[PDB]
Design a protein around this motif. Sequence first.
Motif, PDB file in Angstrom:
ATOM      1  N   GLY A 128      -4.089   7.084   5.236  1.00 49.72           N
ATOM      2  CA  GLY A 128      -3.030   8.081   5.184  1.00 49.72           C
ATOM      3  C   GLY A 128      -2.723   8.467   3.746  1.00 49.72           C
ATOM      4  O   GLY A 128      -2.734   9.645   3.392  1.00 49.72           O
ATOM      5  N   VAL A 129      -2.483   7.458   2.914  1.00 48.31           N
ATOM      6  CA  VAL A 129      -2.142   7.655   1.497  1.00 48.31           C
ATOM      7  C   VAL A 129      -3.163   8.520   0.738  1.00 48.31           C
ATOM      8  O   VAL A 129      -2.793   9.303  -0.138  1.00 48.31           O
ATOM      9  CB  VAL A 129      -2.008   6.287   0.768  1.00 48.31           C
ATOM     10  N   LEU A 130      -4.443   8.365   1.079  1.00 48.68           N
ATOM     11  CA  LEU A 130      -5.528   9.126   0.441  1.00 48.68           C
ATOM     12  C   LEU A 130      -5.441  10.619   0.730  1.00 48.68           C
ATOM     13  O   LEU A 130      -5.602  11.439  -0.178  1.00 48.68           O
ATOM     14  CB  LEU A 130      -6.895   8.604   0.902  1.00 48.68           C
ATOM     15  N   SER A 131      -5.200  10.967   1.998  1.00 50.95           N
ATOM     16  CA  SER A 131      -5.093  12.379   2.416  1.00 50.95           C
ATOM     17  C   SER A 131      -3.863  13.072   1.806  1.00 50.95           C
ATOM     18  O   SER A 131      -3.868  14.295   1.593  1.00 50.95           O
ATOM     19  CB  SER A 131      -5.064  12.505   3.956  1.00 50.95           C
ATOM     20  N   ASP A 132      -2.830  12.281   1.510  1.00 52.56           N
ATOM     21  CA  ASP A 132      -1.598  12.792   0.904  1.00 52.56           C
ATOM     22  C   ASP A 132      -1.747  13.095  -0.594  1.00 52.56           C
ATOM     23  O   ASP A 132      -0.738  13.287  -1.282  1.00 52.56           O
ATOM     24  CB  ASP A 132      -0.453  11.783   1.080  1.00 52.56           C
TER      25      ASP A 132
ATOM     26  N   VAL B  12      -9.971   5.020  -3.890  1.00 48.75           N
ATOM     27  CA  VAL B  12     -11.002   5.274  -2.880  1.00 48.75           C
ATOM     28  C   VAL B  12     -11.762   4.002  -2.451  1.00 48.75           C
ATOM     29  O   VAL B  12     -12.484   4.028  -1.458  1.00 48.75           O
ATOM     30  CB  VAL B  12     -12.011   6.345  -3.390  1.00 48.75           C
ATOM     31  N   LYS B  13     -11.595   2.899  -3.193  1.00 46.19           N
ATOM     32  CA  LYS B  13     -12.326   1.624  -2.923  1.00 46.19           C
ATOM     33  C   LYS B  13     -11.545   0.688  -1.968  1.00 46.19           C
ATOM     34  O   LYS B  13     -12.146  -0.154  -1.290  1.00 46.19           O
ATOM     35  CB  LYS B  13     -12.664   0.892  -4.262  1.00 46.19           C
ATOM     36  N   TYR B  14     -10.222   0.857  -1.906  1.00 48.65           N
ATOM     37  CA  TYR B  14      -9.379  -0.024  -1.089  1.00 48.65           C
ATOM     38  C   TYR B  14      -9.851  -0.155   0.361  1.00 48.65           C
ATOM     39  O   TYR B  14      -9.987  -1.273   0.859  1.00 48.65           O
ATOM     40  CB  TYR B  14      -7.897   0.394  -1.129  1.00 48.65           C
ATOM     41  N   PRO B  15     -10.109   0.974   1.045  1.00 48.98           N
ATOM     42  CA  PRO B  15     -10.590   0.870   2.443  1.00 48.98           C
ATOM     43  C   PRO B  15     -11.838  -0.028   2.625  1.00 48.98           C
ATOM     44  O   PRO B  15     -11.952  -0.725   3.631  1.00 48.98           O
ATOM     45  CB  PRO B  15     -10.914   2.325   2.811  1.00 48.98           C
ATOM     46  N   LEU B  16     -12.751  -0.008   1.654  1.00 46.89           N
ATOM     47  CA  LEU B  16     -13.934  -0.851   1.706  1.00 46.89           C
ATOM     48  C   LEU B  16     -13.554  -2.308   1.504  1.00 46.89           C
ATOM     49  O   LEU B  16     -14.005  -3.178   2.248  1.00 46.89           O
ATOM     50  CB  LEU B  16     -14.941  -0.405   0.659  1.00 46.89           C
ATOM     51  N   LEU B  17     -12.710  -2.565   0.500  1.00 45.94           N
ATOM     52  CA  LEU B  17     -12.166  -3.922   0.242  1.00 45.94           C
ATOM     53  C   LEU B  17     -11.446  -4.523   1.466  1.00 45.94           C
ATOM     54  O   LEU B  17     -11.662  -5.678   1.802  1.00 45.94           O
ATOM     55  CB  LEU B  17     -11.207  -3.902  -0.952  1.00 45.94           C
TER      56      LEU B  17
ATOM     57  N   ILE C 246     -10.972   6.338 -13.260  1.00 46.70           N
ATOM     58  CA  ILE C 246     -10.636   4.908 -13.158  1.00 46.70           C
ATOM     59  C   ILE C 246      -9.700   4.637 -11.957  1.00 46.70           C
ATOM     60  O   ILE C 246     -10.097   3.917 -11.031  1.00 46.70           O
ATOM     61  CB  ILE C 246     -10.092   4.328 -14.493  1.00 46.70           C
ATOM     62  N   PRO C 247      -8.487   5.235 -11.950  1.00 42.20           N
ATOM     63  CA  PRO C 247      -7.621   5.131 -10.771  1.00 42.20           C
ATOM     64  C   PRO C 247      -8.239   5.696  -9.488  1.00 42.20           C
ATOM     65  O   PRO C 247      -8.207   5.034  -8.452  1.00 42.20           O
ATOM     66  CB  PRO C 247      -6.393   5.964 -11.160  1.00 42.20           C
ATOM     67  N   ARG C 248      -8.789   6.907  -9.563  1.00 39.14           N
ATOM     68  CA  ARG C 248      -9.393   7.552  -8.393  1.00 39.14           C
ATOM     69  C   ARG C 248     -10.407   6.637  -7.736  1.00 39.14           C
ATOM     70  O   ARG C 248     -10.374   6.439  -6.517  1.00 39.14           O
ATOM     71  CB  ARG C 248     -10.096   8.860  -8.772  1.00 39.14           C
TER      72      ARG C 248
ATOM     73  N   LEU D  66       0.789  -1.244   0.000  1.00 36.59           N
ATOM     74  CA  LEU D  66       0.000   0.000   0.000  1.00 36.59           C
ATOM     75  C   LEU D  66       0.821   1.293   0.000  1.00 36.59           C
ATOM     76  O   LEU D  66       0.457   2.236  -0.676  1.00 36.59           O
ATOM     77  CB  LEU D  66      -0.988   0.017   1.158  1.00 36.59           C
ATOM     78  N   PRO D  67       1.927   1.350   0.754  1.00 41.25           N
ATOM     79  CA  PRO D  67       2.711   2.580   0.701  1.00 41.25           C
ATOM     80  C   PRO D  67       3.183   2.963  -0.708  1.00 41.25           C
ATOM     81  O   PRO D  67       3.510   4.113  -0.948  1.00 41.25           O
ATOM     82  CB  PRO D  67       3.903   2.266   1.603  1.00 41.25           C
ATOM     83  N   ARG D  68       3.213   2.006  -1.624  1.00 43.38           N
ATOM     84  CA  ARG D  68       3.602   2.287  -3.007  1.00 43.38           C
ATOM     85  C   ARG D  68       2.541   3.086  -3.793  1.00 43.38           C
ATOM     86  O   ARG D  68       2.854   3.707  -4.809  1.00 43.38           O
ATOM     87  CB  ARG D  68       3.897   0.990  -3.744  1.00 43.38           C
TER      88      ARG D  68
END
Lengths: 187, 187
Positions: free
Chosen positions: B181-185, B149-154, B143-145, B90-92
């Motif tokens: 964290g990554v989203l806010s950045d 934004v879907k990862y936290p739900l997954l 598409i990327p966005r 995820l940090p990537r």
Amino acid sequence: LTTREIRRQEAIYEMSRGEQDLIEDLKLARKAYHDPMLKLSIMSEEELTHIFGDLDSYIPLHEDLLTRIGEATKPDGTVEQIGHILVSWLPRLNAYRGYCSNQLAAKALLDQKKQDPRVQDFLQRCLESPFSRKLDLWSFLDIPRSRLVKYPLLLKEILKHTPKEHPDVQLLEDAILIIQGVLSDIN
Amino acid sequence: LTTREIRRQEAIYEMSRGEQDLIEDLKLARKAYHDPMLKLSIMSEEELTHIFGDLDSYIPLHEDLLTRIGEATKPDGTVEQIGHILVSWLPRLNAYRGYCSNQLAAKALLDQKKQDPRVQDFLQRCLESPFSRKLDLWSFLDIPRSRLVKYPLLLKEILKHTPKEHPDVQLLEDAILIIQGVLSDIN
């Protein structure tokens, strides 16, 4: 685009979908069957190469075809010429010489192993899982064989729809001859 | 296998199918759109990286996740632990910092280009072919966005079905924090 030229492209697509499918099954055979049985010592390597052959060579062989076709596919999805790939790829199907030269010796171990409790248990486990993917282990040799014997039909179908004055006509004609030679060098 | 543990695996599968799909669309954007327009000089690179970003980096980034999950998938199709991959992958997603930092500047060129005859002609060609594969060019950034934004739900869905005393609980809890964290950045 003409009705005929659409068939030519449909014929090229039919072929590459066949390769994707073979590759999916060769990888599955390597991951779900060969490697685990080798790891758990349910079968020796000598045995496993009789049943499966050199999976490690066939997989990148067929991937290589699919790579090259993809690279020749334009943005609009069509492929203009394909003979030059096929002619220079088909001779590599000669990598099956060894495996397929003893389909006879293969179906003597095969029939032995289907009485082994350790293989029965291994499969019954694999199969119990709803996320597992099945292969008919006992006629695996059919998967490649079927495919090798199908190429001439796939090539004749592409050629059936190739315009009279197109470079693919000669090349496809020459590729059909290559496939036919390669087949006799193992049967 | 319990009814709950089947959901855990279904949740893991749902996620990787999402990655396969993103990858198919990122590759399509690179092959059918970005590269040809750059080649035909319909758009400069500066422009094309505003619209598409560093496709060359994102594609192997998401492939890398899919590789690692596949390697953790047993013969029976299940995956025993997944948190250790996700936490270290995820940090990537920080590789999107630049692209997504000007979604505003992106949708000023975008709206400019939709009056350009040369892009209109290019698309009308692509689209006329029955073998072409469509992308909504004008909201590609979605598409990327959407995916990010879907990862936290997954992740919360995998965790919902993770047994109380399982190592994935801590790791998934920690991965949800990483994604957040990554989203806010970038927003």
